[PDB]
């Protein structure tokens, strides 16, 4: 009995009877705070405690799973630091925005330049959202991380037309893009089930900030940073902010992000897209 099977790479053991020499042809069987990263730092005194996505910290690629023979670069200070993005003005009918990582930082800083000169990319991310309000403001924001977020299309509304979203929507860049039908998230999936993935609630009466640490999640250790988007970020105003007349109507939403444990490989020429 050679070990060719699919379940023989895990830590769980199963009992199975097999009448052939291949284990995959067998049967089933019995089943058994202040964050300082690099040159930048942040202090969040109003923020809820940090939510670690799937209970794992970002770390360097081990030699067991690493298939690349090149020795990667680790520019710790010039790569991993807090990157502040543009602010999104909130309105009562605002449907929410979404960003595609790691497509936002491709044009920004040393991280963006080395990403164009390197074919292989692996890093962890740090998600931070900032929305400020006073005691007279009542609202709620839902900040969630959905791995492999695919954009759909209404197909003209009839359903008989085959159309795909262009590169502007699938690759919004640094500025981001806005949701059309937040109920389906343009995935055809309910919004009420979005909390199954790592999420954090921003309630303007208590916590005005959010922090989520998302590690690297892919079926491959290294992957191209330009084409493949790892996960998206969703800031959805579930409860519309309400304020009476005379109060300040401009409520910004600031999203700052940082990479963690970045490794680059395959030094090559300049490749934009």
């Amino acid at each position: 009995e050679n070990s060719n099977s699919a379940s023989e790479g895990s830590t769980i053991n199963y009992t199975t009877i097999n009448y052939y020499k291949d284990a995959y042809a067998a049967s089933a069987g019995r089943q058994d705070a202040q964050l300082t990263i690099g040159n930048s730092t942040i202090t969040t005194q109003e923020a809820a405690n940090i939510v670690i996505a799937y209970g794992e910290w970002p770390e360097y690629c081990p030699d067991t799973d690493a298939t690349a023979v090149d020795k990667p670069t680790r520019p710790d200070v010039s790569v991993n630091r807090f990157f502040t993005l543009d602010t999104k003005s909130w309105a009562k009918d605002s449907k929410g925005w979404y960003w595609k990582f790691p497509d936002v930082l491709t044009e920004v800083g040393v991280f963006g330049q080395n990403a164009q000169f390197h074919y292989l990319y692996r890093s962890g991310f740090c998600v931070h959202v900032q929305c400020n309000a006073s005691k007279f403001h009542q609202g709620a924001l839902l900040v969630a991380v959905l791995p492999e977020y695919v954009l759909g299309t209404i197909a003209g509304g009839t359903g008989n037309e085959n159309s795909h979203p262009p590169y502007a929507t699938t690759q919004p860049g640094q500025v981001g893009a806005v949701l059309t039908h937040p109920y389906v998230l343009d995935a055809g999936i309910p919004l009420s089930q979005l909390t199954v993935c790592p999420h954090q609630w921003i309630n303007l009466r208590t916590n005005n900030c959010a922090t989520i640490i998302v590690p690297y999640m892919n079926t491959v250790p290294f992957d191209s940073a330009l084409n493949h988007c790892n996960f998206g970020l969703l800031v959805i105003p579930v409860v519309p902010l309400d304020f009476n007349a005379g109060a300040t109507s401009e409520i910004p939403i600031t999203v700052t992000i940082a990479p963690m444990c970045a490794e680059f490989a395959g030094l090559r020429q300049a490749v934009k897209q």
Partner: antibody, heavy 107, light 107 residues
Framework: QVQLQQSGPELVKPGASVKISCKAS????????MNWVIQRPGQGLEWIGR????????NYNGKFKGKATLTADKSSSTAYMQLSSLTSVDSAVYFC??????????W | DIQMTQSSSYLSVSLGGRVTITCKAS??????LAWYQQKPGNAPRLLIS???SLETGVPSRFSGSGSGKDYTLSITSLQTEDVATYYC?????????FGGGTKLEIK
Amino acid sequence: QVQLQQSGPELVKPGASVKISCKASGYAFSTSWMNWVIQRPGQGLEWIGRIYPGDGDTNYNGKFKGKATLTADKSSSTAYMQLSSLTSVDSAVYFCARRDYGYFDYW
Amino acid sequence: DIQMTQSSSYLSVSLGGRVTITCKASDHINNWLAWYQQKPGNAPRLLISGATSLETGVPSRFSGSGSGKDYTLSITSLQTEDVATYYCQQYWNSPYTFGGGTKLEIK
């Protein structure tokens, strides 16, 4: 200089839809908001809605929430306003302006 | 929904004199107001921004002033090209409420 070029007049029977073009020139199209203003002859004036061409979000009013739909194109630097369910009271003069410090700098 | 009343609709002053137009709102706008000038058949033109500061290209005869909920617009002196319909805007809160308007004529 900054120039805003609209389209010409339109004549259509009630019940159809109409699209109006506004094209900015000499300024960054996705950097600033693009508003819309209706003037009802001759004494009425009110604000319609705005759009940010970078993201594409739309901020409407209470009455015009369901009637008007705003879209934008970053390639041609042009903003669109689509009206649905046109009636006799929906005939008026439409304006295209931009927001800078919170006022309307150019019409 | 902030109602801002502009009264009255019609007032007449001769040339070489002074004119005062009051634009009052319901709540405190934090001195954010924009006076407009629209000639018949043309688009509005900005004059005062923030109830005090001027624009570039606007003559110094236009001077806005005010405090609290009462804001005025003083034009001295009056000429033949300054006769038009004047407006006032509140950009402090959304939606932006435009003024009722004041049409000027010679007495």
